[PDB]
Amino acid sequence: LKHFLNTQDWSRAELDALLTQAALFKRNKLGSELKGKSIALVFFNPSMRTRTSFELGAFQLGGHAVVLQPGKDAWPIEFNLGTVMDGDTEEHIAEVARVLGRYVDLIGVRAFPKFVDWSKDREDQVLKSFAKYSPVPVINMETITHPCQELAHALALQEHFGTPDLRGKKYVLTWTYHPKPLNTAVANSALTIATRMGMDVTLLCPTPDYILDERYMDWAAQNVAESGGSLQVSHDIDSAYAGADVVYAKSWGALPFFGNWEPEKPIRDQYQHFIVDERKMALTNNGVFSHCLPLRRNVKATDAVMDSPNCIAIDEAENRLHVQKAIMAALVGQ
Amino acid sequence: LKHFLNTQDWSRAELDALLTQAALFKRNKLGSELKGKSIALVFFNPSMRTRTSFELGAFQLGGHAVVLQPGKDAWPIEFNLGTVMDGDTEEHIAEVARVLGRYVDLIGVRAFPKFVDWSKDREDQVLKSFAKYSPVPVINMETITHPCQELAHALALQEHFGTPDLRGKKYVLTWTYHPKPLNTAVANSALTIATRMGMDVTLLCPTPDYILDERYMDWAAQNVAESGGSLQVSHDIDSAYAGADVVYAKSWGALPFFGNWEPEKPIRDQYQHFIVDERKMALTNNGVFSHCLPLRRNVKATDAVMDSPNCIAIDEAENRLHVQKAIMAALVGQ
Amino acid sequence: LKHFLNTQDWSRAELDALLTQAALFKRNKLGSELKGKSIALVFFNPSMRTRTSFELGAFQLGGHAVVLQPGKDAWPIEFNLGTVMDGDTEEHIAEVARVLGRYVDLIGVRAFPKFVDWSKDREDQVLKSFAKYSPVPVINMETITHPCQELAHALALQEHFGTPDLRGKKYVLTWTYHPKPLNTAVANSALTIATRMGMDVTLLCPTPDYILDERYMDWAAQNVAESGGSLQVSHDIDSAYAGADVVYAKSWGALPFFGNWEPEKPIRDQYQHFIVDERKMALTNNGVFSHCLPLRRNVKATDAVMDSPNCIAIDEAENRLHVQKAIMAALVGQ
Ligand SMILES: CC(=O)N[C@@H](CCCNC(N)=O)C(=O)O
Ligand SMILES: CC(=O)N[C@@H](CCCNC(N)=O)C(=O)O
Ligand SMILES: CC(=O)N[C@@H](CCCNC(N)=O)C(=O)O
């Protein structure tokens, strides 16, 4: 059974095929690839774009999305094995995935880390459990990685430069400020796809404490060696932005401070200057800027940057619809 | 770009065309006017009829509605310009409207005032912001006016009297009791459409403190002068109801007490006799009664009035479906 | 007007016809029985399977389900007659049912008891009120009985034994532990359908305090006398399980302790051994086991029992989809 948990699990040929189908769907949006089929969108956290794009995607392909929010409308789920379920959880994922598998053709899952302990969050328990027990394909709608965002992002870049081959371009993945520590998911994903695409990637962040989990630094390394691009970690803003072709911003809390954010708060506040403004963007090679959204203006990026013709954030957001339809079409087959 | 923010922005010919299309949809409910199209229903407040009628309307015309509730499932939105988004809001309407505009063909918005300060609530910031940033038509699902209710109401009246021309009929818009101060939206709308339709309108309320915002009193005046009807404010129940052809009730808090309801509470409680009962209705010319719903029985209207053959509230509620389908059909064109 | 409030209101012929149509829908899932039609799914409590199965059912038959949650997205409803609505409730069921009746073709309702006083909960006020005021068929999605579960359960049993005639089989409806007192709905329903099907039923529970409401004990008696099966109450585990063909577990709070659960808590805790394990199941005649779900593993049933080839819980859960489509098809006719 083939799932869409991470682009890293797919071959370059398969990913290129997904991106091409995405481009095709963008030209002809209505289809019958999901005629009479259905997808269960399981959200453990908030969403606007994700719920909307998947729901519309299913509709445009003749299918139907059922939106579920455990703990909200659906019942809370247990993932640990062998435990005595006498707590808050009402049913086990083993039953949840099997039942849904009798109803729907696809299951999408969004579940952010709990932020109590990265040791457990990095295990991707919810996602892996769905994939394990589900008799139908599972799609990652964002957990500790955000593969759908990777392809929406990649497609937007290919559309911007007018070519699928992004090798040679200087890609800057920069950390940005936010009054709170966030998931590293989008950052992990950006690093993964930018390298897989063979670009010269620079992970710009304040201190070594903000470097991403080794798992992804390693995927990136393997990606570079096989793509022809390069990987580099930087802590100097100006040297990073210099001659960049793409600037992708994202904020996240330092992994070393998981479950103990009290002390990291004063640490992030000292770098609220990492904000992407006209000044920094002026250092790039007429580079494009984007963010996965939602974005806090004048905090992560300035109004001027967000409104510049170089900002492709809206295009990337739109592409979520097309890339997800490509993913759902690829996973079904009945 | 044409939106449906208020009936006052539309010409009488356009409104008559909407009402006629509504009547046509009521005769033939299934159609293809929205085939493959979609509408994003953004609810900032509660709804049963509105969400249901729009959702079914989209379905019956071959389209699909995506229901969104910011702060609930979607992310909280910022509307003020240039501010440093370091508060509760996660993203700006500029991004929200632009992204939705890449997904859907129409955007409906429901956002009640905050009731903290009428000076800001009367600016209709949420609605206006959607219309400003959205690349697709925006529909008012109730903010400080309720235009969809106006047309549902108007159609019901035309169906009751068996004619589109309501000129000559005596229309009584009466305030009614409610343990809490409410939005003036429906009242503002009732006054607007009743005058636009050329009826002899009487705004019956307890004291001059319950008179509606000048904006609407003025729209009404302009409407009367151009329709041939009349406008009058009254504080005497019996003189108002006398010879009335239509009685539309609605409760609302005194604008002069916005943000300071503590003292107005004892004021409204002294007029809990404004309730629409058989006695008052017996003073009318075999007049019809209606309320926009939801209605608290034995508080706003008595069980006897609600169950009388003269009450057309259920018909008006039904018409919300037909009028909204007419509105969505008029706004799309692709 | 025909509703689906309880299987007990239907003749055996009608129920057999429903089960047969369910079997037919399971073979050919897509149809046009609900083409252009719609159902309003009103949930006063949580749901995953129910909302999903009904929503998908409507979709597969060419219709559309509108999901509503009063107090959540829709407005809170009043059911008592003649009262002065100056409390929390915003509108009366009389208006709610009539309005929905102008929009949809079917109305499903899920409303659990309040657990404050069984005298009032057993009156089934919400369900009965919808049926009373609705101009369209009403479907019980679980209140104090769970008829849709009965048919899903019955069909699964018929599929297991390869025959619609379950007469002769030994059926054991056993109480099971749960850290909290639950609704007796599923138990009441299991007892009702097992007897209606003519099986030899044994109501196994800890003490006479856990015996179900007389209403259902009596339905069961009437059912046995007319079906050829039998009814028996037991408090001894081993004697009950012995030679059983079917074991259906469900936990519920003692009716005599409604509104006063403080003292029953220590009572249930003394019987946490009623858990369905391999030991008890080994006492049966190669019997099948099932639960309505959601189920707390190692509390209501052991992991070994839930994973045994004899557990048909997933099949029963799947059947909810097919039986409900049969029910909706039977109730519509336009
Ligand atoms: C602010 C916050 O928690 N953001 C989330 C992402 C929101 C979803 N975005 C998307 N494009 O799908 C984060 O990962 O930090
Ligand atoms: C009680 C309350 O807040 N009511 C709202 C209206 C509810 C929506 N009605 C409708 N018909 O769309 C009010 O404007 O006072
Ligand atoms: C735990 C709890 O409250 N359960 C509910 C039932 C949940 C719905 N199940 C179903 N199969 O439709 C009960 O009746 O006890």
Side-chain angles (χ1 to χ4, degrees):
Chain A
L1 185 55
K2 192 78 180 145
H3 300 291
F4 187 73
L5 309 178
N6 278 296
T7 59
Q8 198 74 0
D9 299 327
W10 291 50
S11 72
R12 178 60 186 284
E14 297 174 309
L15 295 180
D16 293 338
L18 281 179
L19 292 172
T20 287
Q21 180 58 55
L24 288 184
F25 273 143
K26 187 169 180 168
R27 293 189 68 83
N28 299 305
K29 57 192 300 201
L30 299 173
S32 57
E33 283 79 2
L34 299 177
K35 190 174 180 52
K37 305 292 180 217
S38 65
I39 176 171
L41 307 178
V42 193
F43 290 99
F44 288 91
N45 307 91
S47 164
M48 182 286 264
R49 275 162 289 286
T50 307
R51 177 264 184 72
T52 302
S53 55
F54 266 107
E55 176 168 337
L56 286 174
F59 170 65
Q60 303 176 337
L61 300 184
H64 181 91
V66 174
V67 178
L68 301 176
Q69 304 187 67
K72 316 304 300 162
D73 49 54
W75 307 92
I77 307 173
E78 175 66 36
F79 295 82
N80 301 320
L81 308 178
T83 306
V84 177
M85 293 181 70
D86 54 49
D88 310 298
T89 54
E90 199 63 48
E91 53 176 346
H92 198 280
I93 181 62
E95 274 63 68
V96 172
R98 278 163 190 164
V99 169
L100 281 180
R102 296 301 189 87
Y103 296 156
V104 301
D105 301 287
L106 299 168
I107 301 175
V109 50
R110 174 115 142 176
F112 297 170
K114 321 173 180 124
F115 297 90
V116 178
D117 174 39
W118 186 240
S119 179
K120 293 188 180 185
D121 289 332
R122 73 191 293 289
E123 198 58 25
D124 213 9
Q125 180 180 51
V126 178
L127 185 61
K128 288 181 180 180
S129 289
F130 270 92
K132 178 180 180 197
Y133 297 107
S134 176
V136 308
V138 172
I139 299 173
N140 183 345
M141 302 195 300
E142 188 183 5
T143 57
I144 56 175
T145 54
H146 203 340
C148 291
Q149 195 70 48
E150 299 183 27
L151 301 189
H153 178 59
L155 180 60
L157 297 181
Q158 303 181 317
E159 293 174 312
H160 173 64
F161 295 107
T163 175
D165 175 42
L166 305 170
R167 290 179 292 176
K169 279 61 180 86
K170 176 177 180 107
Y171 187 100
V172 176
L173 167 53
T174 176
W175 177 90
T176 53
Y177 181 65
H178 184 298
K180 297 182 180 290
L182 306 177
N183 187 1
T184 58
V186 175
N188 302 327
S189 271
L191 192 73
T192 302
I193 200 64
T195 54
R196 197 68 185 282
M197 285 292 98
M199 291 186 269
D200 297 317
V201 177
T202 289
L203 171 57
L204 203 201
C205 52
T207 65
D209 293 359
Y210 283 83
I211 295 178
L212 309 181
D213 191 290
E214 303 176 60
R215 172 187 292 152
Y216 309 111
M217 298 306 297
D218 277 54
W219 280 359
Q222 294 168 51
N223 289 359
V224 162
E226 295 164 54
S227 290
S230 61
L231 180 60
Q232 173 193 316
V233 178
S234 175
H235 303 299
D236 178 61
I237 299 178
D238 297 57
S239 56
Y241 279 79
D245 295 297
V246 184
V247 177
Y248 196 55
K250 185 64 180 88
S251 186
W252 70 85
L255 297 178
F257 296 71
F258 257 71
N260 173 60
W261 304 106
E262 292 283 51
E264 85 92 59
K265 299 182 180 148
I267 303 178
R268 67 177 37 253
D269 294 318
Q270 288 291 175
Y271 304 79
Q272 71 183 308
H273 52 285
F274 259 68
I275 181 171
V276 184
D277 55 38
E278 304 199 67
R279 188 187 93 59
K280 299 176 180 75
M281 290 303 295
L283 303 165
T284 69
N285 171 40
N286 191 46
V288 49
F289 167 71
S290 193
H291 183 275
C292 67
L293 311 185
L295 176 150
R296 306 193 160 214
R297 281 167 173 265
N298 305 315
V299 178
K300 293 190 180 182
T302 65
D303 288 342
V305 177
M306 284 301 289
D307 297 308
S308 69
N310 307 66
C311 179
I312 60 176
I314 306 303
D315 295 299
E316 173 172 341
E318 180 194 328
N319 286 351
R320 285 289 299 283
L321 170 67
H322 313 305
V323 153
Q324 294 165 358
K325 291 170 60 175
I327 294 163
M328 297 190 283
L331 296 175
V332 299
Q334 35 181 165
Chain B
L1 185 55
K2 192 78 180 145
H3 300 291
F4 187 73
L5 309 178
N6 278 296
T7 59
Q8 198 74 0
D9 299 327
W10 291 50
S11 72
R12 178 60 186 284
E14 297 174 309
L15 295 180
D16 293 338
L18 281 179
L19 292 172
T20 287
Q21 180 58 55
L24 288 184
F25 273 143
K26 187 169 180 168
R27 293 189 68 83
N28 299 305
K29 57 192 300 201
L30 299 173
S32 57
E33 283 79 2
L34 299 177
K35 190 174 180 52
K37 305 292 180 217
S38 65
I39 176 171
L41 307 178
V42 193
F43 290 99
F44 288 91
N45 307 91
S47 164
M48 182 286 264
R49 275 162 289 286
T50 307
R51 177 264 184 72
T52 302
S53 55
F54 266 107
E55 176 168 337
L56 286 174
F59 170 65
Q60 303 176 337
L61 300 184
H64 181 91
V66 174
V67 178
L68 301 176
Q69 304 187 67
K72 316 304 300 162
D73 49 54
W75 307 92
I77 307 173
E78 175 66 36
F79 295 82
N80 301 320
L81 308 178
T83 306
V84 177
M85 293 181 70
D86 54 49
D88 310 298
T89 54
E90 199 63 48
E91 53 176 346
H92 198 280
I93 181 62
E95 274 63 68
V96 172
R98 278 163 190 164
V99 169
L100 281 180
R102 296 301 189 87
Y103 296 156
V104 301
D105 301 287
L106 299 168
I107 301 175
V109 50
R110 174 115 142 176
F112 297 170
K114 321 173 180 124
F115 297 90
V116 178
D117 174 39
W118 186 240
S119 179
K120 293 188 180 185
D121 289 332
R122 73 191 293 289
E123 198 58 25
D124 213 9
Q125 180 180 51
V126 178
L127 185 61
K128 288 181 180 180
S129 289
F130 270 92
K132 178 180 180 197
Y133 297 107
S134 176
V136 308
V138 172
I139 299 173
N140 183 345
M141 302 195 300
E142 188 183 5
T143 57
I144 56 175
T145 54
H146 203 340
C148 291
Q149 195 70 48
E150 299 183 27
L151 301 189
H153 178 59
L155 180 60
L157 297 181
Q158 303 181 317
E159 293 174 312
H160 173 64
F161 295 107
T163 175
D165 175 42
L166 305 170
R167 290 179 292 176
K169 279 61 180 86
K170 176 177 180 107
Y171 187 100
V172 176
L173 167 53
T174 176
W175 177 90
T176 53
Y177 181 65
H178 184 298
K180 297 182 180 290
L182 306 177
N183 187 1
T184 58
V186 175
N188 302 327
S189 271
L191 192 73
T192 302
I193 200 64
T195 54
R196 197 68 185 282
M197 285 292 98
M199 291 186 269
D200 297 317
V201 177
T202 289
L203 171 57
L204 203 201
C205 52
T207 65
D209 293 359
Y210 283 83
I211 295 178
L212 309 181
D213 191 290
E214 303 176 60
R215 172 187 292 152
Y216 309 111
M217 298 306 297
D218 277 54
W219 280 359
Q222 294 168 51
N223 289 359
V224 162
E226 295 164 54
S227 290
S230 61
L231 180 60
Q232 173 193 316
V233 178
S234 175
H235 303 299
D236 178 61
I237 299 178
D238 297 57
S239 56
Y241 279 79
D245 295 297
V246 184
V247 177
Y248 196 55
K250 185 64 180 88
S251 186
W252 70 85
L255 297 178
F257 296 71
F258 257 71
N260 173 60
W261 304 106
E262 292 283 51
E264 85 92 59
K265 299 182 180 148
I267 303 178
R268 67 177 37 253
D269 294 318
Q270 288 291 175
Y271 304 79
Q272 71 183 308
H273 52 285
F274 259 68
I275 181 171
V276 184
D277 55 38
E278 304 199 67
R279 188 187 93 59
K280 299 176 180 75
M281 290 303 295
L283 303 165
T284 69
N285 171 40
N286 191 46
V288 49
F289 167 71
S290 193
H291 183 275
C292 67
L293 311 185
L295 176 150
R296 306 193 160 214
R297 281 167 173 265
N298 305 315
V299 178
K300 293 190 180 182
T302 65
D303 288 342
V305 177
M306 284 301 289
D307 297 308
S308 69
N310 307 66
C311 179
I312 60 176
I314 306 303
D315 295 299
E316 173 172 341
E318 180 194 328
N319 286 351
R320 285 289 299 283
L321 170 67
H322 313 305
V323 153
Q324 294 165 358
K325 291 170 60 175
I327 294 163
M328 297 190 283
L331 296 175
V332 299
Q334 35 181 165
Chain C
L1 185 55
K2 192 78 180 145
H3 300 291
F4 187 73
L5 309 178
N6 278 296
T7 59
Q8 198 74 0
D9 299 327
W10 291 50
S11 72
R12 178 60 186 284
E14 297 174 309
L15 295 180
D16 293 338
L18 281 179
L19 292 172
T20 287
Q21 180 58 55
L24 288 184
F25 273 143
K26 187 169 180 168
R27 293 189 68 83
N28 299 305
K29 57 192 300 201
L30 299 173
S32 57
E33 283 79 2
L34 299 177
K35 190 174 180 52
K37 305 292 180 217
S38 65
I39 176 171
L41 307 178
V42 193
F43 290 99
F44 288 91
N45 307 91
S47 164
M48 182 286 264
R49 275 162 289 286
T50 307
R51 177 264 184 72
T52 302
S53 55
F54 266 107
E55 176 168 337
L56 286 174
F59 170 65
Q60 303 176 337
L61 300 184
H64 181 91
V66 174
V67 178
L68 301 176
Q69 304 187 67
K72 316 304 300 162
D73 49 54
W75 307 92
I77 307 173
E78 175 66 36
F79 295 82
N80 301 320
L81 308 178
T83 306
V84 177
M85 293 181 70
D86 54 49
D88 310 298
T89 54
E90 199 63 48
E91 53 176 346
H92 198 280
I93 181 62
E95 274 63 68
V96 172
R98 278 163 190 164
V99 169
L100 281 180
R102 296 301 189 87
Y103 296 156
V104 301
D105 301 287
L106 299 168
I107 301 175
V109 50
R110 174 115 142 176
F112 297 170
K114 321 173 180 124
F115 297 90
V116 178
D117 174 39
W118 186 240
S119 179
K120 293 188 180 185
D121 289 332
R122 73 191 293 289
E123 198 58 25
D124 213 9
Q125 180 180 51
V126 178
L127 185 61
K128 288 181 180 180
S129 289
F130 270 92
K132 178 180 180 197
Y133 297 107
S134 176
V136 308
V138 172
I139 299 173
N140 183 345
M141 302 195 300
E142 188 183 5
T143 57
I144 56 175
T145 54
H146 203 340
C148 291
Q149 195 70 48
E150 299 183 27
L151 301 189
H153 178 59
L155 180 60
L157 297 181
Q158 303 181 317
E159 293 174 312
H160 173 64
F161 295 107
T163 175
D165 175 42
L166 305 170
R167 290 179 292 176
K169 279 61 180 86
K170 176 177 180 107
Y171 187 100
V172 176
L173 167 53
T174 176
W175 177 90
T176 53
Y177 181 65
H178 184 298
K180 297 182 180 290
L182 306 177
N183 187 1
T184 58
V186 175
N188 302 327
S189 271
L191 192 73
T192 302
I193 200 64
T195 54
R196 197 68 185 282
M197 285 292 98
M199 291 186 269
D200 297 317
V201 177
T202 289
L203 171 57
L204 203 201
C205 52
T207 65
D209 293 359
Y210 283 83
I211 295 178
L212 309 181
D213 191 290
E214 303 176 60
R215 172 187 292 152
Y216 309 111
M217 298 306 297
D218 277 54
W219 280 359
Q222 294 168 51
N223 289 359
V224 162
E226 295 164 54
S227 290
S230 61
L231 180 60
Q232 173 193 316
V233 178
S234 175
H235 303 299
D236 178 61
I237 299 178
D238 297 57
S239 56
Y241 279 79
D245 295 297
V246 184
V247 177
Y248 196 55
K250 185 64 180 88
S251 186
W252 70 85
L255 297 178
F257 296 71
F258 257 71
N260 173 60
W261 304 106
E262 292 283 51
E264 85 92 59
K265 299 182 180 148
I267 303 178
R268 67 177 37 253
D269 294 318
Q270 288 291 175
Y271 304 79
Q272 71 183 308
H273 52 285
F274 259 68
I275 181 171
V276 184
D277 55 38
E278 304 199 67
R279 188 187 93 59
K280 299 176 180 75
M281 290 303 295
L283 303 165
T284 69
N285 171 40
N286 191 46
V288 49
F289 167 71
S290 193
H291 183 275
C292 67
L293 311 185
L295 176 150
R296 306 193 160 214
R297 281 167 173 265
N298 305 315
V299 178
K300 293 190 180 182
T302 65
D303 288 342
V305 177
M306 284 301 289
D307 297 308
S308 69
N310 307 66
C311 179
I312 60 176
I314 306 303
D315 295 299
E316 173 172 341
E318 180 194 328
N319 286 351
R320 285 289 299 283
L321 170 67
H322 313 305
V323 153
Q324 294 165 358
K325 291 170 60 175
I327 294 163
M328 297 190 283
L331 296 175
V332 299
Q334 35 181 165

